[PDB]
Amino acid sequence: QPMEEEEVETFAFQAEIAQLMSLIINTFYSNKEIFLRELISNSSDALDKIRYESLTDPSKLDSGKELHINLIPNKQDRTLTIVDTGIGMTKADLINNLGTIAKSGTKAFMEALQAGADISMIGQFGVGFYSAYLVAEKVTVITKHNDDEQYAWESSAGGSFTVRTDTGEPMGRGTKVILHLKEDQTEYLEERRIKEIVKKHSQFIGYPITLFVEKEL
């Protein structure tokens, strides 16, 4: 008689990814705003991909033709969400690409930081997503790929993440990254702050970026 039942899988992060997450979430950096640039960059890449695929197969856009990025601060939940209508991910994609397999860039980036590089370089190593943990204590990724169901990935950087089917609100296609912000990082929920960060770092993104200020009445 339960309203809902669903299987949740828990996976351990590959060792080097766990190491990087611990470094990022614990260490003091003075330029934490770069997380938003990195997430918008990932969305832009995902939008390029579905767009590329649609060139040879227009039906790839039956799940939605609009290619855009939405930013949604919710002060009541203390969350900031970045949403795109890009290519999205399968369950295998989440497990493979968000924790269990480390590319060489993970170790390389930590090496670069030890050698004196700046965290703002993180995107060049292909792991910019994890910069989310500069400002977030927990990150949830909800994703929908063509021909696949909607999944939710989640981690609070304990060395493990979970994956499950998401049945809440169906997306047409794309990815939502939900940042559950640290208590002292709530400035990134303010309109002025989000606007100035986008203006400074995401000028050359070639998709509409739209702010939706969320408040439950």
Ligand SMILES: COc1cc(-c2cc(C)nc(N)n2)c(Cl)cc1Cl
């Ligand atoms: C390249 O690495 C990553 C990419 C993504 C991603 C994938 C897709 C399809 N879209 C968006 N916005 N982001 C994520 Cl959620 C984590 C990592 Cl680690």
